[PDB]
Amino acid sequence: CDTVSAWQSLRGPGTGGYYLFKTTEGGKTDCTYVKGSNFNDAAQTATYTYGNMGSGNQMTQQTASASISGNAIVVGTDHSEVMYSDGSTCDVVRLNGQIELWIHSSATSNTGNLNSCCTDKFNQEKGSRPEHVVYRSTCPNMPQ
Numbered sequence: 001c002d003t004v005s006a007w008q009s010l011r012g013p014g015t016g017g018y019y020l021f022k023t024t025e026g027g028k029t030d031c032t033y034v035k036g037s038n039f040n041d042a043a044q045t046a047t048y049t050y051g052n053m054g055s056g057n058q059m060t061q062q063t064a065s066a067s068i069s070g071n072a073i074v075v076g077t078d079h080s081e082v083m084y085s086d087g088s089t090c091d092v093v094r095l096n097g098q099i100e101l102w103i104h105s106s107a108t109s110n111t112g113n114l115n116s117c118c119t120d121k122f123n124q125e126k127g128s129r130p131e132h133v134v135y136r137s138t139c140p141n142m143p144q
Contacts, residue, residue, distance in 0.1 A: 001120065009087060017142040019103055024131065030139065031053040035050070037049065059140050086115050092125065103135065
């Protein structure tokens with residue numbers, strides 16, 4: 001289960017976005033997502049639009065510059081270390097001592113049939129910590 005690079009993780013398929021599916025972190029807002037755009041492959045920089053369920057059944061949206069430092073995706077002060085990513089469908093990252101499993105928007109109707117490398121890495125790294133499910137099928141689509 002050889003991981004792709006942090007840049008390859010950030011960029012993913014280059015379209016759609018990623019929803020936070022499972023995390024060790026409690027109190028996360030439903031429908032937490034990130035979506036990359038304006039990808040600069042040479043610089044390894046992008047625009048990230050991120051947010052979660054807001055009011056009125058609409059996603060919140062905030063933007064930031066995403067970049068790479070070592071094997072971490074950097075957004076503001078958040079350095080999300082890539083534990084495993086396939087660059088296509090899912091990522092397992094570590095941020096602020098939490099283990100997070102993210103899924104591409106194309107993978108949301110197969111939440112029980114994810115890349116074995118992603119689920120194995122998530123299950124290994126979370127240890128004895130309870131998991132929390134953040135994605136639900138009724139989450140809105142990614143912002144456009």
